[PDB]
């Protein structure tokens, strides 16, 4: 038959072995849902309604037959089992020819209309119907506590897009976190919304409110599942085990809420050493959030503070505030004045030095709001001063919107949860952290190899989160060519903010999403291809320093140009060219042939 509706493509007439089963296909995608989709095709042509490109209905039929299919592996009768295979195999050498159809997402971003939200289904209509009852240098960086204001819906846009690669691990894990609530007693009263996360995925109706999805021991453990499930995605996409992913690594160093996710994943060989090492990751972040929340509880803020936080567009004043693009220890004076008027119980300290400019500060939120008060002083409303002597008298610029962390990590006041949680991690049998880490993971501060046990390493894991300053620049210090990210949420989580720090080097690609913004950090399809290694600028080694010989060996002649306008005017600049220079000559009053016949009054003496 044919892939109809104005862009025809063949779907094999089987000569009475498959011509008889297509009447159970031909009207079947001729539903009114595909037939009210086709009067929109003449005048507002193909803005919607796939058939926008002739692959898009053949995968929509490849959706539809495979989704009203047998739907079970003890297969409902072979009608809805075998013609799926031919409706796969026909496509299998029609538009990919090997090369793993995430490359066809690059083909969708180069040939037809620029759709991504449509592209996500034709991933899913392939890969889910791929499993319907037939047919089975690198530095990793882990995110966590990013600038990602939902932190959960990307898992919702993981389970929705992917059902093959993630449906296994959730059945263990989503039970397992609910299998931990009764263990530590009175953590239930810390967890007053219940941990059946499955129905949060099953419906957006009783998916809970996002701020209480933003409460810390809801945010911190599931984010690690996203930085675990995507690692199974590429293992399932590249046909690999995690050891075959751990074989192809040289970095594997991530942020605070993903460093310990990178810790257990380095000593992970099999799929069978996987889920036993997932419990290294569940029982930390579950216990991490429950210990610090008891140390500093959330309080309802005085709403007198809540007004002026809106006019400066700082958002909710949640106790984590970063600054933008000032040099350090200027603002420490403003810390020094505020910590002077503060008593000892609520003094304020700077957590992070992430990047050369941005500095994260954590502490009590009133005093964090109190820091804004003197930082609303010395701050311009962004008026232009590059006209009159910018680099001598400037009033500077800021951007200090808040961060939605509901427990002030990397601080000093939250000491007793540190020594308490490692008792809790002693309590269950998982605190080995032996030498079995293969890839040299670097620290979130001063990246030692960390196979220097007699550290009892599942004790360092927590003061690295709640005690320690990070200084993220010296965390990297790599020798790579490209960099993995597993940023939990968008093209925003700790990949773009790392990108300023490195130059002359990698064009790093992340796994989450399929967007692009510029040919700087493009992603979506570099994980699943061949014969296209984009290594961009080497602005150091490449473009550096060289003089140069002639055809018969000279020196070029010596790069230092010269061209003024009140000295150079005549044949007394001719001698300036006589030694070794790049002489220019203009602005000689009149241009009425005088200084023009005079050009050859120094061109013959040149």
């Amino acid at each position: 038959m044919d892939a109809y509706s104005t862009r025809p493509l063949t779907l094999s007439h089987g000569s009475l072995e498959h011509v008889l089963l297509v009447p159970t296909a031909s009207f079947f995608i001729a539903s009114q849902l595909q037939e009210q989709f086709n009067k929109i095709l003449p005048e507002p042509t193909e803005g919607f309604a796939a058939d926008d490109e002739p692959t898009t209905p053949a995968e929509l039929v490849g959706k539809f037959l495979g989704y009203v299919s047998s739907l079970v592996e003890p297969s409902k009768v072979g009608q809805f089992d075998q013609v799926l295979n031919l409706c796969l195999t026909e496509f299998e050498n029609c538009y990919l020819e090997g090369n793993d159809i995430h490359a066809l997402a690059a083909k969708l971003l180069q040939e037809n209309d620029t759709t991504l939200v449509k592209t996500k289904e034709l991933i899913k209509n392939y890969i889910t119907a791929r499993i319907m009852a037939k047919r089975p240098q690198l530095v990793a960086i882990f995110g966590g506590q990013g600038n990602t204001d939902d932190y959960f819906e990307e898992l919702r846009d993981l389970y929705q897009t992917y059902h093959v690669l993630v449906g296994d691990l959730i059945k263990f894990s989503a039970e397992t976190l609910s299998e931990l609530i009764r263990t530590t007693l009175d953590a239930e009263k810390v967890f007053t919304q219940g941990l059946n996360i499955l129905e949060w995925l099953e419906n957006p109706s009783n998916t809970p409110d996002k701020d209480y999805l933003l409460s810390i021991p809801i945010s911190c453990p599931l984010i690690g599942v996203i930085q675990l499930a995507h690692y199974v995605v590429t293992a399932k996409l590249l046909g690999f085990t995690p050891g075959e992913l751990r074989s192809y690594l040289k970095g594997a160093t991530g942020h605070s809420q993903g460093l310990v996710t990178a810790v257990a994943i380095a000593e992970t060989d099999s799929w069978e050493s996987f889920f036993v090492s997932v419990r290294k990751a569940i029982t930390v972040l579950f216990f991490i959030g429950v210990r610090c929340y008891e140390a500093y509880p959330n309080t309802s803020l005085p709403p007198s503070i809540l007004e002026d936080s809106l006019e400066n567009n700082e958002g909710v004043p949640s106790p984590m505030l970063s600054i933008s693009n000032l040099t350090q220890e200027q603002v420490q004076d403003y810390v020094n004045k505020t910590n002077s008027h503060l008593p000892a119980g609520k003094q304020v300290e700077i957590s992070l030095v992430n990047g050369a400019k941005n500095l994260v500060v954590s502490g009590p939120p009133q005093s964090l709001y109190g820091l804004n008060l003197t930082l609303r002083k010395a701050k311009a409303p962004s008026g232009l001063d590059q006209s009159r002597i910018p680099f001598s008298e400037r009033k500077l610029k800021f951007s200090n919107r808040f961060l939605p962390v509901a427990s002030p990590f990397h601080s000093h006041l939250l000491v007793p949860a540190s020594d308490l949680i490692n008792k809790d991690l002693v309590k269950n049998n998982v605190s080995f952290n032996a030498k079995d880490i293969q890839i040299p993971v670097y620290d979130t501060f001063d990246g030692s190899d960390l196979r220097v046990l007699s550290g009892s390493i599942s004790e360092r894991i927590v003061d690295c989160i709640i005690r320690l300053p990070v200084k993220w620049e010296t965390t990297t210090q790599f020798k790579a060519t490209h960099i993995l990210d597993f940023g939990p949420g968008g093209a925003s989580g700790l990949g773009v903010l790392t990108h300023r720090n490195k130059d002359g080097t990698g064009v790093r690609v992340i796994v989450a999403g399929t967007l692009d913004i510029n040919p700087d950090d493009d992603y979506g399809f570099k994980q699943e291809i061949f014969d296209v290694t984009s290594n961009g600028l080497k602005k150091n080694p490449n473009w550096l320093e060289e003089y140069h010989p002639k055809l018969i060996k000279n020196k070029s002649x010596x790069x230092x140009x010269x061209x003024x306008x009140x000295x150079x005017x005549x044949x007394x600049x001719x001698x300036x060219x006589x030694x070794x220079x790049x002489x220019x000559x203009x602005x000689x009053x009149x241009x009425x042939x005088x200084x023009x016949x005079x050009x050859x009054x120094x061109x013959x003496x040149x």
Side-chain angles (χ1 to χ4, degrees), residues 187-209:
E188 302 84 333
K189 323 153 185 186
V190 178
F191 274 52
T192 48
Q193 43 196 17
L195 210 45
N196 200 338
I197 81 177
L198 295 150
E199 53 94 5
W200 306 347
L201 273 70
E202 289 142 30
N203 51 64
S205 65
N206 266 309
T207 290
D209 52 332

Side-chain angles (χ1 to χ4, degrees), residues 234-275:
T234 167
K236 281 226 202 172
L237 183 59
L238 277 298
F240 283 170
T241 178
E244 274 150 0
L245 291 188
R246 104 176 170 182
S247 314
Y248 283 162
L249 279 180
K250 207 214 157 194
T253 289
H255 209 77
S256 171
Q257 283 254 349
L259 185 88
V260 308
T261 306
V263 162
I265 206 64
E267 44 159 352
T268 306
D269 206 319
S270 66
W271 285 46
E272 297 73 29
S273 112
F274 194 82
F275 325 127

Side-chain angles (χ1 to χ4, degrees), residues 145-151 210-211 213-216 219 314 316-321 401-407 409:
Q145 299 324 290
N147 310 357
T148 300
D149 305 336
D150 52 343
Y151 284 136
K210 63 104 175 179
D211 54 340
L213 305 182
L214 189 43
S215 63
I216 291 293
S219 302
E314 310 194 16
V316 166
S318 172
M320 193 64 65
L321 182 53
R401 46 179 182 167
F402 262 96
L403 316 180
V405 191
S407 304
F409 292 160

Side-chain angles (χ1 to χ4, degrees), residues 308-527 536 541 549 557-574:
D308 70 336
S309 40
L310 305 177
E311 49 86 22
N312 202 9
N313 314 69
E314 310 194 16
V316 166
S318 172
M320 193 64 65
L321 182 53
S322 288
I323 47 177
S324 55
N325 309 130
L326 273 79
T327 78
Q328 85 282 341
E329 301 323 282
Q330 309 158 348
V331 309
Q332 165 63 35
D333 317 335
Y334 302 104
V335 188
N336 285 306
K337 291 183 296 293
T338 45
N339 279 346
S340 69
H341 296 279
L342 273 155
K346 291 177 186 183
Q347 264 202 352
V348 187
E349 197 262 358
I350 163 175
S351 276
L352 262 65
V353 196
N354 193 293
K357 307 302 270 200
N358 292 269
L359 305 173
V360 194
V361 185
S362 48
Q366 305 185 58
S367 312
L368 280 173
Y369 166 70
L371 200 74
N372 277 316
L373 315 179
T374 188
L375 287 173
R376 283 145 79 178
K377 203 251 186 169
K379 158 188 184 187
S382 111
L384 173 144
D385 75 88
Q386 211 191 35
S387 46
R388 77 300 190 280
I389 307 298
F391 280 64
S392 286
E393 68 263 12
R394 186 164 166 181
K395 186 183 275 183
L396 319 148
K397 305 196 170 184
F398 284 86
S399 186
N400 317 125
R401 46 179 182 167
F402 262 96
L403 316 180
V405 191
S407 304
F409 292 160
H410 306 262
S411 90
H412 298 339
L413 69 157
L414 314 157
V415 74
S418 76
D419 208 356
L420 181 60
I421 192 185
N422 292 311
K423 302 168 170 56
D424 287 333
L425 267 302
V426 152
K427 274 170 190 62
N428 45 316
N429 311 265
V430 82
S431 39
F432 71 112
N433 295 355
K435 320 311 192 185
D436 315 309
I437 277 184
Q438 291 191 335
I439 305 100
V441 24
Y442 271 26
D443 278 297
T444 318
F445 157 70
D446 223 348
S448 93
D449 184 81
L450 296 173
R451 302 173 273 240
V452 195
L453 186 56
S454 0
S456 194
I457 302 169
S458 38
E459 150 69 34
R460 175 214 53 49
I461 49 160
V462 20
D463 58 291
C464 131
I465 303 180
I466 185 63
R467 195 56 187 212
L468 275 174
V470 162
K471 318 167 185 193
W472 185 259
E473 161 197 351
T474 191
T475 63
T476 50
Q477 310 273 3
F478 287 123
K479 196 57 67 211
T481 304
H482 317 292
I483 279 179
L484 261 189
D485 178 22
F486 280 77
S492 318
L494 290 163
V496 286
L497 278 76
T498 44
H499 186 69
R500 172 220 73 80
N501 303 268
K502 317 202 171 194
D503 266 311
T505 327
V507 200
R508 48 99 193 155
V509 186
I510 86 172
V511 59
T514 39
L515 280 170
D516 55 339
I517 41 172
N518 49 355
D520 168 80
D521 41 4
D522 284 339
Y523 70 63
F525 60 91
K526 300 294 184 181
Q527 77 285 350

Side-chain angles (χ1 to χ4, degrees), residues 299-309 317 365-366 369:
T299 187
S300 83
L301 195 89
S304 300
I305 301 180
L306 280 179
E307 288 93 12
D308 70 336
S309 40
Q366 305 185 58
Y369 166 70

